[PDB]
Design a binder for this molecule. Structure first.
Ligand code: ANP
Ligand code: MG
Ligand code: MG
Length: 460
């Protein structure tokens, strides 16, 4: 009753190795995404480790591991690839969409280099929570369908339980796929990937009547829009290597990510990123640098001129999306030219006071235009900014009430803070999944107000 196609396998020969998952020892299902399963037509009986542990294949699957390469922290890293994951198959939905089923933690692969081919419970829990949180914030992302843990030791800085995440996404194409064949000097394979992407994900483009310029122009726009959305909610990816950039503009590969607590533009959550390359405030520039690396691979068959014109459009797209999202977050229903100074003055203040990002915006969503009605060392500077902020609000001539409702629909009450995830992980390792299930539920409603500790700052 589920329909898998062998599209990648049949259309992109020599981009993968066929092979099967390696099962863990005493694997067992600890969580699965019941809502998403209903959307994908997966019978609920399939969840009672089976395919979620890579111990069974469903009819139509033909598992392979993809090859790719990448720049890592700005330096060419050579061959990478699906070193600890496997594309089990591609499921076609009634929508006509296809959805990759990718098993992360599936065992050793020809692409594992010196890696064990395994993922650990804590990283699979964090990735499931992050990708579902992102999805309910309305930001493009891969999705999490299931987690299995095991009794199989996996050694990181300490011994951890081996685990696997069943990841679901429209595609796993990365900028690094193109880079891989470009630097191997196989420009034909580069173009094969472009044509495949256009055929299956930009089919409204008529074949070669400007298809390549228009497609890459959309690729830029989707990455700019993705970054704009991360910035707005205070998400720091932390490992924006070119192999972790999704061609479609999906958030891809959750590792040492971080949603901001205290507002700090130079926030680094990846403690291996010693130069702060992937600090929060560099994500706009880094994503442009990554697009330029992708643009490098297409110069054999796309005019270097059209490539730079598409690269040129990046900062206007990003600024359009960011500006429209911020105006909503500040409750600006119209657009006055006071807006950029009020913003710049807010972010300057928030930074000096180390204000919590999410909480500040959610509290600002209670503002009443005519009232002056506490978290700042310099209350003098706040009430002066708040004063000029509320005066500009009155210019909208819209009610206290509908501004508040607009803001509450774009400023979440809850984000996936590191200490909420940690708490679910600690409980999970002890065999209590209740916290994990409770937190996943809460993240399906980020814009709804809460009474519990899911909306508090971390305890310190
Ligand atoms: N434990 C591991 N064993 C084998 N390969 C690994 C391991 N950890 C990372 N790699 C590979 O090292 C490269 C960089 O890792 P990373 O960007 O973190 O990807 P990943 O989290 O393993 N998989 P993904 O979410 O598909 O991008 C990729 O080729 C990974 O497949
Ligand atoms: Mg990766
Ligand atoms: Mg990773």
């Amino acid at each position: 009753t589920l329909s898998f196609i062998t599209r990648w396998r049949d259309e992109l020969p020599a981009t993968y190795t066929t092979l099967s998952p390696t099962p863990l020892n005493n694997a067992r299902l600890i969580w699965h995404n019941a809502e998403l399963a209903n959307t994908l037509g997966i019978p609920s009986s399939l969840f009672k480790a089976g395919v979620w542990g890579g111990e069974t294949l469903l009819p139509g699957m033909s598992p392979l591991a993809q090859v790719y390469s990448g720049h890592q922290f700005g330096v060419w890293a050579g061959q990478l690839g699906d070193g600890r994951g496997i594309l089990l198959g591609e499921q076609r939905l009634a929508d006509g969409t296809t959805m990759d089923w990718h098993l992360k933690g599936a065992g050793l692969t020809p692409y594992s280099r010196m890696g064990d081919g395994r993922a650990v419970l804590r990283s699979t829990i964090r990735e499931s929570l992050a990708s579902e949180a992102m999805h309910y914030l309305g930001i493009p992302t891969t999705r999490a369908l299931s987690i299995v843990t095991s009794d199989s030791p996996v050694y990181r800085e300490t011994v951890e339980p081996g685990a696997m995440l069943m990841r679901v996404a429209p595609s796993h194409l990365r900028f690094g796929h193109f880079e891989h064949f470009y630097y191997r000097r196989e420009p034909e394979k580069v173009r094969q990937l472009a044509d495949f992407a256009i055929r299956h994900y930009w089919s409204h483009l008529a074949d070669d009547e400007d298809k390549y310029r228009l497609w890459f122009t959309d690729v830029v726009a989707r990455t700019a829009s993705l970054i704009a959305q991360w910035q707005t909610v205070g998400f720091a990816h932390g490992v924006m290597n070119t192999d972790n950039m999704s061609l479609l503009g999906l958030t891809l590969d959750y590792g040492p990510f971080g949603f901001l607590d205290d507002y700090e533009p130079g926030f680094i959550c990846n403690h291996s990123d010693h130069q702060g390359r992937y600090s929060f405030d560099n994500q706009p520039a880094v994503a442009l640098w990554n697009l330029q690396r992708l643009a490098q691979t297409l110069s054999p068959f796309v005019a270097v001129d059209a490539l730079n014109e598409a690269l040129d459009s990046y900062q206007q797209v990003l600024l359009t999306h960011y500006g429209q999202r911020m105006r909503q977050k500040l409750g600006f229903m119209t657009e006055q030219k006071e807006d950029n100074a009020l913003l710049n003055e807010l972010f300057s203040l928030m930074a000096r006071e180390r204000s919590d990002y999410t909480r500040t915006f959610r509290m600002l969503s209670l503002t009443e235009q005519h009232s002056a009605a506490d978290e700042f060392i310099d209350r003098a500077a706040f009430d002066d900014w708040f004063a000029r902020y509320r005066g500009r609000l009155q210019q909208d001539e819209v009610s206290d009430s509908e501004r508040q409702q607009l803001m509450q629909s774009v400023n979440p009450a809850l984000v996936l803070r590191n200490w909420l995830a940690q708490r679910a992980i600690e409980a999970a390792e002890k065999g209590d999944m209740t916290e994990l299930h409770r937190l996943h539920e809460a993240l399906r409603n980020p814009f709804s107000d809460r009474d519990d500790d899911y909306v508090s700052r971390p305890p310190d």
